[PDB]
Design a protein around this ligand. Structure first.
Ligand SMILES: *[C@@H]1O[C@H](CO)[C@@H](O)[C@H](O)[C@H]1NC(C)=O
Length: 327
């Protein structure tokens, strides 16, 4: 306060352990880089395959990727949804058209553009476009159990993602990024930047990592939205990205740049050819850490035990939710 200083509150805390660094000789991850017309699967070995997964002549509006089923749903610019299941980077099943009911919620016409996947409830989230407003509305994989969350807004979201484990849906406009839960109870706006680009969500890190192609610098956005932090970036404007540990994937139009966010982009650690792709609006990493079922923190407390002659009623408290987690 103005007059003085209060007492000192002490706390003991340990941060998490260092992630193991895989070199250029021993990189074994797999990626899907997704274009508007050319969707391609690549393996990050020194001897890696540069193979086509799927080619669509129509422009694809948004994608959604599942880990447990390996399915890339496809939504075009018209609004007809094609469900396409793959297996390990190639065709096992073709595209199936999935029809969606409007119901009594969608009173007027609305067309789809957006795709996102919850892996805990197996529940799809899409926002709509009105031919006069942009309104988020949730349904099942089959599609009949449709009900809407939130309120319509005029600003177009360009990218929708799900952090299922912490219970959040992020929609990001050209005006702001927003944070909202799965049941429609609480709605929060995070940060105000004119035209942000692509964001990637890590659920264990609790950090939204975002690249502006207009600014061309790092930006860190937290889940409450009040924390903003830059880092030094290698210079080239990449439309999307993926993060693999301490290494950063930056796709050029002919190669891929492997940097550890301090070395230059002119000398990558390893390069993989991307010559069939025109541009990279969506870089998707195939790790099991991209969709964890593990919340990665747990210790019970307040153990109460009420006993008897030959029995006991024993009650404990669940570990509490964090503010970066949801209800
Ligand atoms: C940090 O160290 C103290 C002192 O040894 C210990 O009691 C505490 O458990 C540590 N904190 C964590 C979160 O491990």
């Amino acid at each position: 306060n103005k007059q003085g200083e209060g007492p000192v509150a002490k706390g003991f805390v340990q941060t998490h352990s260092a992630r193991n660094e895989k070199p250029a000789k021993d990189l074994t991850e797999s990626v899907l880089l997704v274009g508007r017309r050319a969707v391609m699967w690549q393996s990050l070995e020194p001897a890696g395959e540069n193979s086509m997964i799927y080619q669509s002549q129509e422009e694809l509006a948004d994608i959604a990727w599942s880990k447990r089923e390996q399915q890339l749903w496809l939504l075009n610019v018209h609004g007809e949804l094609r469900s396409l299941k793959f297996e390990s980077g190639q065709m096992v099943s073709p595209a199936q058209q999935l029809k969606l009911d409007l119901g009594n919620i969608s009173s007027g016409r609305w067309v789809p553009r957006r795709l996102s996947f919850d892996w805990l409830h197996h529940r799809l989230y899409f926002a709509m476009e009105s031919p006069e407003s942009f309104q988020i509305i949730s349904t099942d994989l089959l599609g009949e159990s449709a009900q809407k969350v939130g309120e319509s807004f005029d600003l177009p979201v360009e990218q929708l993602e799900v952090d299922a484990l912490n219970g959040w849906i992020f929609w990001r406009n050209e005006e702001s990024l927003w944070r909202q839960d799965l049941h429609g109870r609480m709605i929060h706006r995070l940060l105000r930047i004119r035209q942000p680009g692509w964001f990637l969500v890590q659920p264990q890190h609790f950090i939204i990592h975002l690249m502006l192609p207009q600014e061309g610098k790092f930006l860190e956005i937290s889940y409450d939205g009040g924390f903003k932090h830059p880092l030094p970036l290698p210079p080239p404007h990449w439309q999307s990205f993926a993060l693999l540990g301490r290494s950063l994937l930056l796709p050029d139009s002919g190669q891929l740049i492997l940097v550890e966010q301090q070395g230059q982009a002119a000398s990558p650690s390893a390069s993989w050819p991307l010559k069939n792709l025109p541009d990279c609006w969506a870089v998707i990493l195939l790790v099991p850490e991209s969709q964890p079922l593990t919340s990665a923190g747990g210790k019970p407390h307040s153990l109460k035990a009420l006993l008897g002659a030959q029995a006991a009623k024993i009650s404990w408290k669940e570990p509490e939710r964090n503010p970066y987690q949801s209800a």
